[PDB]
Amino acid sequence: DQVQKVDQYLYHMRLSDETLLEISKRFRKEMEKGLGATTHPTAAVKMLPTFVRSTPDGTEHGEFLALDLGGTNFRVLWVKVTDNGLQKVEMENQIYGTQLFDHIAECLANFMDKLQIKDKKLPLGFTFSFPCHQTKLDESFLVSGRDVVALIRKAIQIDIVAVVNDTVGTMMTCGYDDHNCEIGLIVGTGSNACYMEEMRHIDMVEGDEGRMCINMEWGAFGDDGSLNDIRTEFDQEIDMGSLNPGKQLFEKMISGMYMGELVRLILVKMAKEELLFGGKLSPELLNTGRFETKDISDIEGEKDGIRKAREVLMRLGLDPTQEDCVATHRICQIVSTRSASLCAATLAAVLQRIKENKGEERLRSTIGVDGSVYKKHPHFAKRLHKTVRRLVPGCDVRFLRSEDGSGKGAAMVTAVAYRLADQHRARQKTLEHLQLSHDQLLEVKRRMKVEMERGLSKETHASAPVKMLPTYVCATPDGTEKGDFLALDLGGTNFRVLLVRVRNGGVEMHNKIYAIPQEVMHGTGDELFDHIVQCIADFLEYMGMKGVSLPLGFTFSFPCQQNSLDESILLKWTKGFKASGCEGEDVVTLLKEAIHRREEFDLDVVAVVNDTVGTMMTCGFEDPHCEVGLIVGTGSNACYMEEMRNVELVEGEEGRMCVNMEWGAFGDNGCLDDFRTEFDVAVDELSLNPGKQRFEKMISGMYLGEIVRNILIDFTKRGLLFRGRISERLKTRGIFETKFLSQIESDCLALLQVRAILQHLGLESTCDDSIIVKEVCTVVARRAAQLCGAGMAAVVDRIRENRGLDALKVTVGVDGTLYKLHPHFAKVMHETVKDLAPKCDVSFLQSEDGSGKGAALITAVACRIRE
Ligand SMILES: O=C(/C=C/c1ccc(Cl)c(Cl)c1)N[C@@H]1[C@@H](O)[C@H](O)[C@@H](CO)O[C@@H]1O
Ligand SMILES: O=C(/C=C/c1ccc(Cl)c(Cl)c1)N[C@@H]1[C@@H](O)[C@H](O)[C@@H](CO)O[C@@H]1O
Ligand SMILES: O=P(O)(O)OC[C@H]1O[C@@H](O)[C@H](O)[C@@H](O)[C@@H]1O
């Protein structure tokens, strides 16, 4: 009965759920304004970057050091951690110009009274009460004054240090106890909170890509007038009386420092109005601060706390009724309940942000909490929890409590900062072996040159790993070439048959792709060319060509010995094919025999060319400056036009010949060994042909994905990735496809596509893992594009010297899936060529018609020469 009058009188201090949703929405707008780059400097809620980028792992370990500067205690803590199950961190502390740092800073040996640690150079966690502006984990300056984190160091005569808000320290120690804790919260002398934000949302820090803890400083929510319609006569007066009038308006209606004073002032207003005490106001009731937050807890805590109201009201010298002790009780509830409901509105907004960032239909999140009002007040926690869960029904939230706070939380942030830095240099020492200097890439260029000579030399051509094989392709297309030409493209991902229909005064192009069943690729050679010619027939019919008599160019991309344009002998099947009775055989004969067994059409097989050569001719039809061809794909190879005088395996010195380099075998004689890593060695030794195609295995095919998953497995074993947990998929050779490198490195911001892939190889991965995985794919694919570039530099610069030129303008026909679908690799190769062959001006061109079109052109050119 007396309550209902207080309830009615304090009516504006009892806030409905509807107005708490209004408030939380308002605080989200305040949230975005402080994160935004234009709005920040005018934002009331500053949304400060913490530079804490990871919550605790569970694996942290070490001896750590730290100090609480809050000024109440001025304590200095100590802690040690270990990665075993029991999570207790051993904690021991005792409380406490240029002379100004060194005053009690003498305790470096004085807090060694326990472990006498002054011989141990040791990391330092640092928590700092006053306000600052920090640009890094270690850096800051006070506004209420130059440097700090660096200035406390020159007072040295050992440390590694970071500086953190007490709300972040709270989140971090609750994080080591529960790994789901993304929010710190303090309700105490003051009130603030921090949470983990996505780096794409933090404009004030460059990044994209990652999470950072944001120190909201919500104490200042409302300093611009956004809370005025819920603020109160009593709030205005607490503000005007404050040491900081105008600032911290939300903190003042929440924090413990102002709650006693807020109910006092309410008593005074009611006494003066005859509603309490019979208007008899003692002297002490008018003295500021005598009704204290401590008292609000006592009145509300106990069985009969209506007596302890009476006990306190008389400590202030009054004559309370019982109906007076009842009113002071409910005035206490209304103040502390409004405080609790207000932290629930602004948490409701933070939890709604994290839910959005995350993508989960129900947020599962853990709030680390601390501070006088939360822990000691009997009912504040129950009302905060109950009120949050009502404002976010799609929550599942759980709160935790940290004994340490600003003390051990500053140590725990040093444990995570140390862990990260330690695992980083570990990963970086590895990745550095795949990072090649300018000088190194010139040496690669130089070594490719002598290997090119070695193979062109008839003396050394037998031992030489880069064979420099003659292609018997000497003649560009010339003016009039007429007629229909069949071509074949075999050995790529796509086997296809082509009819290029060439007019003069105009190349008409037609193709079709056919599958080769694994059973046929792995069958007998009869079955394989029977199948190929059954596709030629299905195509002739598809074209209404039926049995017409057509010449045939043939792109066959396997290591052959060519004795002439129409004769080449297969050395070894590669890629998918193992078909019997083929290796060691003329490939044109095997094809011709399969055409006769079909007994349908007459085909004249004029030429067999490597895909490099076919690609160079395709691109040269458009661009007459194209003297080179390059594949980066299932495999890597290249060809240029050499001088007949330099091709000793073919008699005569007049003119040009294209030479298939087989450059993938560069390094089969050892010449790359001192640029090769353990992961190269391992990929080589577990491959199908150990010791063969070493350069190919650094720059292309499946081999790139294998280098990645060899690195990722090396990292995981060392606990440097995925928190040490190995997937079974990840253990499988070939599982990490080279197209993942393109997808992972094309990915940005949330890195969702990287995670999708890591899921596929079923791995339990954080968003920081995705960043590390993307780092690895970028190193590997850059070493690939730089190596390919160092080879292609030697190629083009040799063409330049052969011709005496001071400057060479060349075009390089390129093809292969890795070159055209990877985001950076064409870019980085071109840069490497321009960097390593300054005297050459190299265009690259991307065929789009495939190497078949050049097979058909090489055929047409070979006809006119005989016609
Ligand atoms: O002390 C402050 C704010 C100081 C400040 C900053 C800028 C200006 Cl312009 C002014 Cl007038 C004051 N905030 C504290 C939080 O850092 C802390 O997390 C929380 C719990 O300890 O207490 C307070 O809310
Ligand atoms: O596959 C190979 C060669 C492999 C090879 C050679 C010799 C031996 Cl002894 C052994 Cl074990 C394997 N060469 C291909 C080139 O012909 C093709 O131009 C390029 C692009 O398709 O892919 C490959 O590099
Ligand atoms: O090796 P990949 O990724 O299939 O790319 C190489 C092939 O690419 C094709 O587009 C060309 O037409 C072929 O001549 C070539 O062999």
Side-chain angles (χ1 to χ4, degrees), residues 1-3 5-24 26-28 30-62 64-72 76 78-79 81-82 85 87 93 95-102 104-105 107-109 111 117 122-128 131-140 145 147-150 153-155 157 160-322 324-360 362 364-402 405-407 409-428 430-481 483-502 504-517 520-545 547-548 550-577 579-602 604-650 652-653 655-763 765-826 828-833 835-847 849-866:
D1 172 65
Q2 182 62 45
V3 299
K5 178 190 81 178
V6 174
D7 292 355
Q8 178 71 260
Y9 181 75
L10 291 180
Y11 163 72
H12 302 284
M13 290 185 70
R14 300 189 309 109
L15 301 173
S16 63
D17 285 350
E18 183 170 359
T19 70
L20 293 173
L21 297 174
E22 176 66 26
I23 293 172
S24 68
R26 297 184 186 182
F27 181 73
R28 194 170 187 277
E30 306 302 318
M31 293 186 84
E32 294 168 352
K33 288 170 64 178
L35 290 173
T38 62
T39 56
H40 179 68
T42 274
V45 186
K46 288 310 183 187
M47 298 288 179
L48 301 179
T50 65
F51 300 105
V52 167
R53 308 199 55 182
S54 301
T55 70
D57 191 72
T59 58
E60 298 78 354
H61 52 279
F64 297 99
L65 186 64
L67 58 78
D68 182 4
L69 190 144
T72 306
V76 172
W78 176 92
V79 176
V81 182
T82 57
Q87 295 175 336
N93 66 338
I95 187 171
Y96 291 91
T98 297
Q99 292 179 336
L100 186 62
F101 287 164
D102 293 346
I104 296 173
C107 293
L108 179 61
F111 198 80
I117 55 173
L122 195 142
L124 172 65
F126 184 77
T127 186
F128 187 86
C132 295
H133 174 64
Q134 62 174 9
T135 59
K136 290 159 64 182
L137 268 179
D138 57 349
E139 197 168 8
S140 289
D147 193 357
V148 299
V149 64
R153 290 181 177 173
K154 298 305 287 186
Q157 297 302 325
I160 304 98
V161 61
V163 172
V164 59
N165 192 40
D166 65 349
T167 192
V168 177
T170 293
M171 180 190 64
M172 293 295 288
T173 57
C174 298
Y176 182 75
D177 292 340
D178 178 358
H179 294 89
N180 202 339
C181 174
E182 287 168 342
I183 303 170
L185 168 59
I186 288 178
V187 186
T189 306
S191 178
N192 189 19
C194 62
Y195 73 101
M196 294 302 292
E197 181 75 50
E198 298 301 316
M199 288 282 286
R200 34 161 179 155
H201 287 151
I202 308 173
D203 301 349
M204 302 299 295
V205 176
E206 187 181 4
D208 261 343
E209 290 188 359
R211 292 163 67 243
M212 192 180 289
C213 184
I214 291 295
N215 170 348
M216 286 181 280
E217 287 295 332
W218 58 34
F221 175 42
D223 293 352
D224 66 352
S226 53
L227 297 184
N228 283 346
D229 65 350
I230 69 101
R231 298 187 79 239
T232 228
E233 168 187 358
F234 309 97
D235 283 319
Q236 300 183 338
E237 183 175 1
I238 287 108
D239 176 42
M240 302 294 182
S242 59
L243 277 60
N244 66 342
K247 304 292 194 298
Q248 301 295 96
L249 298 186
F250 185 79
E251 198 186 20
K252 286 173 179 178
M253 59 189 81
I254 278 177
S255 179
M257 171 173 62
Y258 305 118
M259 280 188 68
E261 180 67 6
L262 189 54
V263 49
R264 182 178 76 80
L265 297 183
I266 293 170
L267 297 176
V268 174
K269 186 186 173 69
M270 288 189 186
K272 288 165 58 183
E273 294 183 357
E274 296 298 319
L275 275 66
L276 296 177
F277 307 99
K280 193 179 290 290
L281 279 70
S282 66
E284 295 84 356
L285 183 68
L286 291 174
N287 192 332
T288 192
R290 294 290 186 85
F291 197 89
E292 62 190 346
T293 296
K294 169 64 167 60
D295 301 340
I296 305 171
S297 300
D298 299 345
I299 285 98
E300 288 180 348
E302 62 183 341
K303 178 189 70 65
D304 186 4
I306 301 90
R307 67 164 293 279
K308 185 169 280 288
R310 187 178 300 281
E311 177 177 358
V312 174
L313 286 170
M314 293 174 183
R315 183 172 59 84
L316 301 180
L318 290 70
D319 271 338
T321 302
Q322 84 282 10
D324 286 347
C325 289
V326 167
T328 287
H329 182 68
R330 190 165 182 78
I331 296 169
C332 279
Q333 287 178 339
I334 286 176
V335 168
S336 68
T337 283
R338 189 194 63 175
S339 175
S341 297
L342 283 172
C343 295
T346 58
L347 282 174
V350 179
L351 295 174
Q352 180 57 51
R353 177 65 157 179
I354 292 172
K355 180 179 177 181
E356 297 178 357
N357 289 347
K358 192 168 295 299
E360 302 302 323
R362 290 176 182 168
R364 164 60 179 86
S365 184
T366 298
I367 302 176
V369 189
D370 192 355
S372 300
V373 176
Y374 183 76
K375 293 181 177 179
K376 288 178 178 173
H377 184 283
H379 301 289
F380 182 80
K382 177 173 68 70
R383 300 171 183 169
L384 176 56
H385 305 172
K386 186 178 289 178
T387 307
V388 161
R389 299 192 177 98
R390 298 185 296 100
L391 295 177
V392 293
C395 67
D396 179 65
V397 182
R398 82 180 65 199
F399 314 46
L400 292 176
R401 171 175 173 161
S402 69
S406 57
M412 188 61 71
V413 169
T414 304
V416 172
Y418 184 86
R419 177 176 63 73
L420 297 184
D422 186 66
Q423 299 182 338
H424 186 79
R425 75 178 65 84
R427 291 197 300 278
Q428 193 60 51
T430 297
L431 293 176
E432 186 273 327
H433 292 88
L434 288 83
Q435 299 180 339
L436 298 178
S437 55
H438 179 77
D439 287 354
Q440 282 174 322
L441 292 168
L442 286 182
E443 179 60 13
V444 176
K445 178 182 173 181
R446 187 192 74 76
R447 297 187 188 180
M448 175 69 95
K449 177 182 172 291
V450 330
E451 290 305 329
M452 295 174 74
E453 298 169 3
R454 190 194 306 282
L456 288 176
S457 173
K458 69 181 181 302
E459 175 176 353
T460 51
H461 177 80
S463 68
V466 179
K467 294 308 190 184
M468 304 294 284
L469 300 179
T471 64
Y472 300 93
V473 179
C474 301
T476 181
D478 169 5
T480 185
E481 292 93 352
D484 296 352
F485 299 98
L486 287 164
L488 293 178
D489 193 8
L490 180 68
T493 65
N494 295 337
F495 161 63
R496 71 182 66 200
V497 180
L498 291 66
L499 187 148
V500 303
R501 193 166 189 167
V502 60
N504 55 345
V507 297
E508 184 72 15
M509 184 77 179
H510 298 285
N511 73 37
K512 180 176 176 180
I513 297 173
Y514 318 32
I516 298 166
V520 172
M521 293 183 283
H522 289 86
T524 63
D526 286 342
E527 295 173 349
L528 172 62
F529 300 54
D530 281 342
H531 191 284
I532 293 170
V533 297
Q534 189 184 6
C535 299
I536 292 175
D538 180 12
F539 177 85
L540 273 65
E541 190 173 5
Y542 170 87
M543 293 293 293
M545 300 297 295
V548 296
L550 292 168
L552 187 144
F554 174 42
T555 304
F556 182 76
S557 61
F558 302 95
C560 298
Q561 174 181 353
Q562 266 200 327
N563 301 297
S564 68
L565 182 62
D566 68 350
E567 173 181 355
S568 65
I569 296 171
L570 180 62
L571 297 181
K572 178 178 287 298
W573 282 122
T574 64
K575 303 181 178 82
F577 310 45
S580 60
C582 298
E583 296 177 352
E585 289 303 325
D586 179 1
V587 164
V588 178
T589 298
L590 294 177
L591 179 69
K592 285 178 169 174
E593 301 177 352
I595 292 170
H596 288 80
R597 294 192 294 273
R598 165 70 68 174
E599 285 292 332
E600 298 177 357
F601 46 88
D602 56 348
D604 178 18
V605 171
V606 183
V608 291
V609 300
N610 176 302
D611 49 345
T612 53
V613 180
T615 287
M616 175 190 75
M617 287 300 301
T618 300
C619 291
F621 179 72
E622 296 171 350
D623 187 355
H625 282 273
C626 178
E627 290 185 342
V628 181
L630 178 65
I631 305 298
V632 189
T634 303
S636 183
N637 192 25
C639 63
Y640 49 158
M641 301 294 292
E642 182 76 31
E643 301 316 332
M644 281 297 301
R645 53 185 172 88
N646 284 324
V647 186
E648 300 182 357
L649 276 64
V650 165
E653 303 193 354
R656 313 292 196 193
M657 187 170 286
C658 185
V659 300
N660 180 350
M661 292 182 66
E662 286 295 317
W663 94 334
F666 174 54
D668 291 347
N669 63 353
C671 62
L672 288 173
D673 286 346
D674 62 19
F675 305 113
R676 299 181 69 245
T677 65
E678 54 176 324
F679 310 100
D680 288 322
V681 170
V683 168
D684 189 18
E685 293 185 345
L686 298 178
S687 62
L688 187 64
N689 292 292
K692 304 292 174 292
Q693 297 296 103
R694 281 179 179 167
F695 183 69
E696 202 187 28
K697 288 172 181 172
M698 304 174 78
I699 65 165
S700 67
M702 89 164 295
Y703 301 115
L704 257 41
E706 269 291 308
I707 302 167
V708 175
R709 65 164 281 267
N710 283 333
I711 291 165
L712 298 185
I713 283 170
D714 184 50
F715 283 173
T716 303
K717 284 182 183 300
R718 312 215 304 277
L720 297 169
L721 186 71
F722 310 119
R723 183 172 60 188
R725 297 173 183 170
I726 196 69
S727 171
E728 291 302 322
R729 294 284 187 91
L730 192 66
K731 287 169 185 175
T732 297
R733 178 185 163 87
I735 192 66
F736 183 140
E737 305 176 14
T738 287
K739 72 179 178 185
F740 295 161
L741 274 77
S742 302
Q743 303 176 349
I744 290 170
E745 178 165 350
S746 296
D747 198 10
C748 51
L749 297 181
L751 296 178
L752 293 183
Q753 188 59 40
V754 179
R755 180 172 65 195
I757 289 160
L758 296 177
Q759 173 175 339
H760 172 61
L761 313 161
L763 292 163
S765 64
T766 60
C767 70
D768 293 347
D769 291 335
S770 295
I771 293 165
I772 290 162
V773 170
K774 181 175 177 182
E775 185 175 358
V776 174
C777 299
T778 289
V779 162
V780 173
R782 184 172 178 86
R783 185 170 68 28
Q786 284 178 318
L787 285 171
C788 179
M792 183 59 67
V795 165
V796 293
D797 209 56
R798 177 176 170 87
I799 293 174
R800 179 185 60 82
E801 304 173 0
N802 288 344
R803 303 178 183 181
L805 299 182
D806 282 334
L808 165 64
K809 176 180 182 175
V810 206
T811 300
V812 176
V814 185
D815 193 356
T817 47
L818 178 62
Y819 173 85
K820 58 181 65 182
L821 299 176
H822 185 279
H824 296 91
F825 156 153
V828 176
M829 176 203 173
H830 305 176
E831 297 174 357
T832 305
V833 173
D835 187 66
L836 297 170
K839 287 179 283 188
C840 303
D841 169 51
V842 188
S843 299
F844 309 52
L845 179 65
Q846 182 169 342
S847 63
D849 279 339
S851 45
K853 179 185 176 184
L857 289 168
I858 294 162
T859 291
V861 175
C863 290
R864 56 172 279 269
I865 283 177
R866 66 190 187 194

